[PDB]
PDB file of C-alpha atoms and ligand atoms in Angstrom:
ATOM      1  CA  UNK X   6     -11.687 -33.412 -12.171  1.00 39.21           C
ATOM      2  CA  UNK X   7     -10.021 -30.005 -11.965  1.00 43.49           C
ATOM      3  CA  UNK X   8      -9.744 -27.304 -14.654  1.00 41.70           C
ATOM      4  CA  UNK X   9      -7.410 -24.303 -14.679  1.00 43.93           C
ATOM      5  CA  UNK X  10      -8.722 -21.275 -16.590  1.00 41.70           C
ATOM      6  CA  UNK X  11      -6.688 -18.068 -17.035  1.00 45.99           C
ATOM      7  CA  UNK X  12      -8.309 -14.824 -18.193  1.00 47.30           C
ATOM      8  CA  UNK X  13      -6.279 -12.265 -20.184  1.00 45.06           C
ATOM      9  CA  UNK X  14      -7.007  -9.130 -22.182  1.00 45.63           C
ATOM     10  CA  UNK X  15      -6.449  -5.364 -22.290  1.00 46.29           C
ATOM     11  CA  UNK X  16      -6.888  -3.236 -19.183  1.00 43.32           C
ATOM     12  CA  UNK X  17     -10.469  -2.371 -18.274  1.00 44.33           C
ATOM     13  CA  UNK X  18     -12.014  -4.746 -20.813  1.00 42.86           C
ATOM     14  CA  UNK X  19     -14.045  -6.476 -18.099  1.00 39.98           C
ATOM     15  CA  UNK X  20     -11.981  -9.461 -16.953  1.00 42.01           C
ATOM     16  CA  UNK X  21     -12.440  -8.936 -13.219  1.00 42.48           C
ATOM     17  CA  UNK X  22     -16.179  -8.152 -13.435  1.00 42.85           C
ATOM     18  CA  UNK X  23     -16.656 -11.308 -15.483  1.00 43.45           C
ATOM     19  CA  UNK X  24     -14.868 -13.446 -12.865  1.00 44.58           C
ATOM     20  CA  UNK X  25     -16.432 -11.752  -9.854  1.00 42.99           C
ATOM     21  CA  UNK X  26     -19.960 -12.178 -11.241  1.00 45.43           C
ATOM     22  CA  UNK X  27     -19.326 -15.873 -11.903  1.00 47.88           C
ATOM     23  CA  UNK X  28     -17.483 -16.840  -8.712  1.00 49.95           C
ATOM     24  CA  UNK X  29     -18.897 -14.339  -6.226  1.00 49.07           C
ATOM     25  CA  UNK X  30     -22.246 -13.723  -7.943  1.00 49.46           C
ATOM     26  CA  UNK X  31     -21.533 -10.035  -7.437  1.00 47.70           C
ATOM     27  CA  UNK X  32     -20.595  -7.179  -9.787  1.00 48.65           C
ATOM     28  CA  UNK X  33     -17.556  -5.158  -8.546  1.00 53.20           C
ATOM     29  CA  UNK X  34     -18.611  -1.893  -6.902  1.00 52.73           C
ATOM     30  CA  UNK X  35     -15.455  -0.046  -7.997  1.00 53.34           C
ATOM     31  CA  UNK X  36     -12.486  -0.391 -10.322  1.00 51.34           C
ATOM     32  CA  UNK X  37      -9.145  -1.642  -8.984  1.00 54.68           C
ATOM     33  CA  UNK X  38      -6.362  -2.669 -11.384  1.00 54.88           C
ATOM     34  CA  UNK X  39      -5.598  -6.381 -11.078  1.00 58.07           C
ATOM     35  CA  UNK X  40      -2.180  -8.030 -10.835  1.00 56.52           C
ATOM     36  CA  UNK X  41      -3.263 -11.529  -9.823  1.00 58.55           C
ATOM     37  CA  UNK X  42      -6.300 -12.990  -8.055  1.00 59.29           C
ATOM     38  CA  UNK X  43      -7.467 -16.605  -7.830  1.00 57.55           C
ATOM     39  CA  UNK X  44     -11.053 -17.798  -7.541  1.00 57.18           C
ATOM     40  CA  UNK X  45     -12.487 -21.268  -6.915  1.00 59.63           C
ATOM     41  CA  UNK X  46     -15.737 -22.602  -8.389  1.00 60.34           C
ATOM     42  CA  UNK X  47     -17.390 -25.841  -9.500  1.00 61.34           C
ATOM     43  CA  UNK X  48     -19.453 -26.658 -12.599  1.00 60.31           C
ATOM     44  CA  UNK X  49     -21.654 -29.738 -13.053  1.00 63.06           C
ATOM     45  CA  UNK X  50     -21.389 -31.652 -16.331  1.00 62.74           C
ATOM     46  CA  UNK X  51     -23.392 -34.806 -17.090  1.00 61.37           C
ATOM     47  CA  UNK X  52     -23.737 -35.991 -13.474  1.00 60.44           C
ATOM     48  CA  UNK X  53     -20.274 -34.744 -12.614  1.00 59.30           C
ATOM     49  CA  UNK X  54     -18.942 -31.829 -10.557  1.00 60.85           C
ATOM     50  CA  UNK X  55     -15.767 -30.231 -11.945  1.00 62.88           C
ATOM     51  CA  UNK X  56     -13.562 -27.960  -9.835  1.00 61.25           C
ATOM     52  CA  UNK X  57     -12.506 -24.734 -11.520  1.00 61.03           C
ATOM     53  CA  UNK X  58      -9.402 -22.773 -10.549  1.00 55.00           C
ATOM     54  CA  UNK X  59      -9.770 -19.300 -12.102  1.00 56.02           C
ATOM     55  CA  UNK X  60      -6.947 -16.811 -12.568  1.00 56.33           C
ATOM     56  CA  UNK X  61      -7.480 -13.079 -13.045  1.00 53.37           C
ATOM     57  CA  UNK X  62      -4.531 -11.179 -14.554  1.00 60.20           C
ATOM     58  CA  UNK X  63      -3.306  -7.678 -15.437  1.00 62.50           C
ATOM     59  CA  UNK X  64      -3.982  -6.225 -18.860  1.00 57.42           C
ATOM     60  CA  UNK X  65      -1.131  -3.777 -18.329  1.00 58.68           C
ATOM     61  CA  UNK X  66       2.175  -3.909 -20.245  1.00 57.65           C
ATOM     62  CA  UNK X  67       3.907  -3.123 -16.934  1.00 57.39           C
ATOM     63  CA  UNK X  68       3.145  -6.701 -15.898  1.00 55.96           C
ATOM     64  CA  UNK X  69       4.283  -8.569 -19.005  1.00 57.01           C
ATOM     65  CA  UNK X  70       7.080 -10.148 -16.953  1.00 56.00           C
ATOM     66  CA  UNK X  71       4.761 -11.148 -14.113  1.00 53.09           C
ATOM     67  CA  UNK X  72       1.720 -12.421 -15.986  1.00 55.18           C
ATOM     68  CA  UNK X  73       3.488 -15.526 -17.433  1.00 56.17           C
ATOM     69  CA  UNK X  74       3.698 -17.089 -13.952  1.00 58.76           C
ATOM     70  CA  UNK X  75      -0.004 -17.996 -14.225  1.00 56.93           C
ATOM     71  CA  UNK X  76       0.191 -19.861 -17.539  1.00 56.16           C
ATOM     72  CA  UNK X  77       1.710 -23.245 -16.558  1.00 55.92           C
ATOM     73  CA  UNK X  78      -0.730 -26.157 -16.813  1.00 55.12           C
ATOM     74  CA  UNK X  79      -3.637 -24.085 -18.112  1.00 57.97           C
ATOM     75  CA  UNK X  80      -6.515 -26.082 -19.558  1.00 60.87           C
ATOM     76  CA  UNK X  81      -8.149 -23.079 -21.226  1.00 63.33           C
ATOM     77  CA  UNK X  82      -7.432 -19.408 -21.730  1.00 61.04           C
ATOM     78  CA  UNK X  83     -10.095 -16.753 -22.186  1.00 62.31           C
ATOM     79  CA  UNK X  84      -8.877 -13.836 -24.275  1.00 63.35           C
ATOM     80  CA  UNK X  85     -11.164 -10.862 -23.654  1.00 63.57           C
ATOM     81  CA  UNK X  86     -11.689  -7.526 -25.392  1.00 63.23           C
ATOM     82  CA  UNK X  87     -14.071  -4.580 -24.914  1.00 64.88           C
ATOM     83  CA  UNK X  88     -16.926  -4.394 -27.464  1.00 66.95           C
ATOM     84  CA  UNK X  89     -17.124  -0.643 -26.791  1.00 67.63           C
ATOM     85  CA  UNK X  90     -13.439  -0.150 -27.692  1.00 68.31           C
ATOM     86  CA  UNK X  91     -12.385  -1.546 -31.126  1.00 73.76           C
ATOM     87  CA  UNK X  92      -8.720  -0.935 -30.294  1.00 73.91           C
ATOM     88  CA  UNK X  93      -8.901  -3.691 -27.667  1.00 72.61           C
ATOM     89  CA  UNK X  94      -9.827  -6.193 -30.373  1.00 73.46           C
ATOM     90  CA  UNK X  95      -6.608  -5.351 -32.264  1.00 69.89           C
ATOM     91  CA  UNK X  96      -4.610  -6.331 -29.151  1.00 67.94           C
ATOM     92  CA  UNK X  97      -6.009  -9.847 -29.467  1.00 66.01           C
ATOM     93  CA  UNK X  98      -4.085 -10.321 -32.702  1.00 64.87           C
ATOM     94  CA  UNK X  99      -1.115  -8.045 -31.993  1.00 65.43           C
ATOM     95  CA  UNK X 100      -0.313  -9.183 -28.463  1.00 66.11           C
ATOM     96  CA  UNK X 101      -2.428 -11.790 -26.722  1.00 62.27           C
ATOM     97  CA  UNK X 102      -2.390 -14.537 -29.340  1.00 61.99           C
ATOM     98  CA  UNK X 103       1.394 -14.371 -29.477  1.00 64.07           C
ATOM     99  CA  UNK X 104       1.801 -14.457 -25.711  1.00 66.50           C
ATOM    100  CA  UNK X 105      -0.470 -17.474 -25.289  1.00 66.43           C
ATOM    101  CA  UNK X 106       1.204 -19.403 -28.116  1.00 65.20           C
ATOM    102  CA  UNK X 107       4.551 -18.594 -26.498  1.00 65.36           C
ATOM    103  CA  UNK X 108       3.659 -19.818 -23.005  1.00 60.15           C
ATOM    104  CA  UNK X 109       0.521 -21.922 -23.479  1.00 57.16           C
ATOM    105  CA  UNK X 110       1.012 -23.911 -26.648  1.00 55.44           C
ATOM    106  CA  UNK X 111      -1.681 -26.564 -27.147  1.00 59.23           C
ATOM    107  CA  UNK X 112      -4.074 -24.908 -24.685  1.00 62.28           C
ATOM    108  CA  UNK X 113      -7.672 -24.219 -25.763  1.00 59.21           C
ATOM    109  CA  UNK X 114      -8.358 -20.513 -26.465  1.00 61.83           C
ATOM    110  CA  UNK X 115     -11.731 -18.817 -26.306  1.00 60.83           C
ATOM    111  CA  UNK X 116     -12.310 -15.294 -27.604  1.00 59.44           C
ATOM    112  CA  UNK X 117     -14.692 -13.411 -25.356  1.00 57.73           C
ATOM    113  CA  UNK X 118     -16.448 -10.155 -26.198  1.00 58.05           C
ATOM    114  CA  UNK X 119     -17.191  -8.290 -22.962  1.00 54.99           C
ATOM    115  CA  UNK X 120     -19.610  -5.448 -22.171  1.00 54.41           C
ATOM    116  CA  UNK X 121     -22.102  -6.442 -24.871  1.00 51.55           C
ATOM    117  CA  UNK X 122     -24.613  -4.146 -23.163  1.00 54.10           C
ATOM    118  CA  UNK X 123     -22.675  -1.148 -24.499  1.00 53.18           C
ATOM    119  CA  UNK X 124     -23.198  -2.043 -28.169  1.00 57.38           C
ATOM    120  CA  UNK X 125     -26.649  -0.416 -27.869  1.00 57.88           C
ATOM    121  CA  UNK X 126     -25.801   2.178 -25.239  1.00 59.86           C
ATOM    122  CA  UNK X 127     -26.709   5.590 -26.694  1.00 63.37           C
ATOM    123  CA  UNK X 128     -23.922   7.553 -24.996  1.00 63.11           C
ATOM    124  CA  UNK X 129     -21.360   5.061 -26.301  1.00 62.04           C
ATOM    125  CA  UNK X 130     -22.794   5.076 -29.840  1.00 60.89           C
ATOM    126  CA  UNK X 131     -22.650   8.894 -29.865  1.00 59.98           C
ATOM    127  CA  UNK X 132     -19.090   9.115 -28.569  1.00 60.19           C
ATOM    128  CA  UNK X 133     -17.781   6.463 -30.984  1.00 64.75           C
ATOM    129  CA  UNK X 134     -19.770   8.004 -33.830  1.00 61.28           C
ATOM    130  CA  UNK X 135     -18.221  11.438 -33.301  1.00 59.62           C
ATOM    131  CA  UNK X 136     -14.950   9.713 -34.183  1.00 58.95           C
ATOM    132  CA  UNK X 137     -16.069   7.673 -37.174  1.00 58.08           C
ATOM    133  CA  UNK X 138     -16.330   4.475 -35.152  1.00 62.02           C
ATOM    134  CA  UNK X 139     -18.861   1.864 -34.064  1.00 58.44           C
ATOM    135  CA  UNK X 140     -18.864  -0.866 -31.373  1.00 54.67           C
ATOM    136  CA  UNK X 141     -17.306  -4.187 -32.361  1.00 54.71           C
ATOM    137  CA  UNK X 142     -19.891  -6.274 -34.202  1.00 51.17           C
ATOM    138  CA  UNK X 143     -20.545  -9.946 -33.554  1.00 48.74           C
ATOM    139  CA  UNK X 144     -19.184 -10.674 -37.046  1.00 48.62           C
ATOM    140  CA  UNK X 145     -15.933  -8.840 -36.388  1.00 46.38           C
ATOM    141  CA  UNK X 146     -15.581 -10.846 -33.205  1.00 45.48           C
ATOM    142  CA  UNK X 147     -16.287 -14.153 -34.915  1.00 47.07           C
ATOM    143  CA  UNK X 148     -13.812 -13.474 -37.754  1.00 47.28           C
ATOM    144  CA  UNK X 149     -11.056 -12.554 -35.293  1.00 48.96           C
ATOM    145  CA  UNK X 150     -11.644 -15.819 -33.427  1.00 49.67           C
ATOM    146  CA  UNK X 151     -11.107 -17.837 -36.596  1.00 50.23           C
ATOM    147  CA  UNK X 152      -8.079 -15.750 -37.519  1.00 49.51           C
ATOM    148  CA  UNK X 153      -6.303 -16.574 -34.250  1.00 51.37           C
ATOM    149  CA  UNK X 154      -7.500 -20.170 -34.082  1.00 54.76           C
ATOM    150  CA  UNK X 155      -9.829 -19.789 -31.092  1.00 57.87           C
ATOM    151  CA  UNK X 156     -12.147 -22.716 -30.341  1.00 53.76           C
ATOM    152  CA  UNK X 157     -15.038 -20.272 -30.494  1.00 50.64           C
ATOM    153  CA  UNK X 158     -16.210 -16.701 -30.079  1.00 47.05           C
ATOM    154  CA  UNK X 159     -18.724 -15.792 -27.394  1.00 44.54           C
ATOM    155  CA  UNK X 160     -20.107 -12.551 -25.949  1.00 45.32           C
ATOM    156  CA  UNK X 161     -21.390 -11.498 -22.537  1.00 42.55           C
ATOM    157  CA  UNK X 162     -22.379  -8.660 -20.253  1.00 41.18           C
ATOM    158  CA  UNK X 163     -21.255  -9.096 -16.670  1.00 42.66           C
ATOM    159  CA  UNK X 164     -23.265  -5.974 -15.876  1.00 41.04           C
ATOM    160  CA  UNK X 165     -26.653  -6.942 -17.297  1.00 43.68           C
ATOM    161  CA  UNK X 166     -26.750 -10.722 -17.669  1.00 46.50           C
ATOM    162  CA  UNK X 167     -25.354 -13.146 -15.113  1.00 42.39           C
ATOM    163  CA  UNK X 168     -26.471 -15.977 -17.383  1.00 43.37           C
ATOM    164  CA  UNK X 169     -24.341 -14.807 -20.284  1.00 43.34           C
ATOM    165  CA  UNK X 170     -21.412 -15.066 -17.884  1.00 43.66           C
ATOM    166  CA  UNK X 171     -22.244 -18.585 -16.709  1.00 44.76           C
ATOM    167  CA  UNK X 172     -22.584 -19.667 -20.345  1.00 41.44           C
ATOM    168  CA  UNK X 173     -18.968 -18.676 -20.968  1.00 42.02           C
ATOM    169  CA  UNK X 174     -17.681 -20.974 -18.247  1.00 42.54           C
ATOM    170  CA  UNK X 175     -20.139 -23.678 -19.267  1.00 43.27           C
ATOM    171  CA  UNK X 176     -18.553 -23.686 -22.731  1.00 42.55           C
ATOM    172  CA  UNK X 177     -14.999 -23.321 -21.419  1.00 39.20           C
ATOM    173  CA  UNK X 178     -15.489 -26.352 -19.176  1.00 42.42           C
ATOM    174  CA  UNK X 179     -16.825 -28.453 -22.053  1.00 45.45           C
ATOM    175  CA  UNK X 180     -13.886 -27.472 -24.252  1.00 43.99           C
ATOM    176  CA  UNK X 181     -11.606 -28.943 -21.544  1.00 42.29           C
ATOM    177  CA  UNK X 182     -13.622 -31.966 -20.408  1.00 42.82           C
ATOM    178  CA  UNK X 183     -12.960 -33.566 -23.793  1.00 40.54           C
ATOM    179  CA  UNK X 184      -9.384 -32.667 -24.747  1.00 41.85           C
TER     180      UNK X 184
HETATM  181  N1  GTP H 201     -21.197  -1.380 -19.203  1.00 43.52           N
HETATM  182  C1  GTP H 201     -20.355  -2.490 -18.666  1.00 43.52           C
HETATM  183  N2  GTP H 201     -19.325  -2.021 -17.949  1.00 43.52           N
HETATM  184  C2  GTP H 201     -18.625  -3.118 -17.499  1.00 43.52           C
HETATM  185  C3  GTP H 201     -18.920  -4.396 -17.739  1.00 43.52           C
HETATM  186  N3  GTP H 201     -17.931  -5.108 -17.081  1.00 43.52           N
HETATM  187  C4  GTP H 201     -16.998  -4.363 -16.422  1.00 43.52           C
HETATM  188  N4  GTP H 201     -17.498  -3.090 -16.727  1.00 43.52           N
HETATM  189  C5  GTP H 201     -16.870  -1.796 -16.251  1.00 43.52           C
HETATM  190  O1  GTP H 201     -15.547  -1.695 -16.804  1.00 43.52           O
HETATM  191  C6  GTP H 201     -14.539  -1.260 -15.848  1.00 43.52           C
HETATM  192  C7  GTP H 201     -13.227  -2.174 -15.777  1.00 43.52           C
HETATM  193  O2  GTP H 201     -13.876  -3.524 -15.636  1.00 43.52           O
HETATM  194  P1  GTP H 201     -12.847  -4.645 -14.933  1.00 43.52           P
HETATM  195  O3  GTP H 201     -13.567  -5.894 -14.857  1.00 43.52           O
HETATM  196  O4  GTP H 201     -12.238  -4.145 -13.600  1.00 43.52           O
HETATM  197  O5  GTP H 201     -11.631  -4.638 -15.984  1.00 43.52           O
HETATM  198  P2  GTP H 201     -10.360  -5.522 -16.134  1.00 43.52           P
HETATM  199  O6  GTP H 201     -10.274  -6.097 -17.539  1.00 43.52           O
HETATM  200  O7  GTP H 201     -10.328  -6.524 -15.085  1.00 43.52           O
HETATM  201  O8  GTP H 201      -9.115  -4.457 -15.922  1.00 43.52           O
HETATM  202  P3  GTP H 201      -7.411  -4.677 -15.421  1.00 43.52           P
HETATM  203  O9  GTP H 201      -7.386  -5.349 -14.071  1.00 43.52           O
HETATM  204  O10 GTP H 201      -6.873  -3.269 -15.437  1.00 43.52           O
HETATM  205  O11 GTP H 201      -6.738  -5.437 -16.458  1.00 43.52           O
HETATM  206  C8  GTP H 201     -15.246  -1.063 -14.580  1.00 43.52           C
HETATM  207  O12 GTP H 201     -15.462   0.287 -14.304  1.00 43.52           O
HETATM  208  C9  GTP H 201     -16.570  -1.902 -14.590  1.00 43.52           C
HETATM  209  O13 GTP H 201     -17.529  -1.418 -13.855  1.00 43.52           O
HETATM  210  C10 GTP H 201     -19.906  -4.840 -18.426  1.00 43.52           C
HETATM  211  O14 GTP H 201     -20.398  -5.944 -18.792  1.00 43.52           O
HETATM  212  N5  GTP H 201     -20.771  -3.692 -18.981  1.00 43.52           N
HETATM  213 MG1   MG H 202      -9.009  -6.651 -13.412  1.00 47.01          MG
END
């Protein structure tokens, strides 16, 4: 069949890189703010090829009135945050959960931790440490997922592991195949 997946989350948390790596098997060479972009892809499940319609959105508040146009008929929504920026995890509870429940009631939500490669990146550890902070831990991610009612919590690194990215869509597809 066909599955519609929409990806939301704060600006620069890694939404576009995640989608580009999965659909185009290519990591973006530069950063360009996204408004809307649509990608097509297909995933095989138990001797079956499912067609995926993927929607990239803007993490910017300036597009709060535009973003909702992509929600209708969504099978699953991936809420992303940046493991290297704890503040982006707060947005999941403060903004994203409420927006999805408002426009996508009954849709399956998946909490996705992006840029896992930075959790052990020395420069990042040092910068965060100089301000009494640490990268988001797996446990913090998992607890947030339960708090907002997400089907599950999963992490990835579009930069270092293409497989971690494919796993996300593998799970997303399964969560929809059996609604
Ligand atoms: N270290 C690391 N950097 C990443 C990873 N993914 C994306 N980035 C970097 O993070 C920046 C923003 O990533 P994007 O994918 O464009 O972010 P976005 O969430 O789509 O941003 P908006 O369109 O503004 O909402 C870029 O400079 C990427 O190169 C990742 O897995 N690891
Ligand atoms: Mg983007």
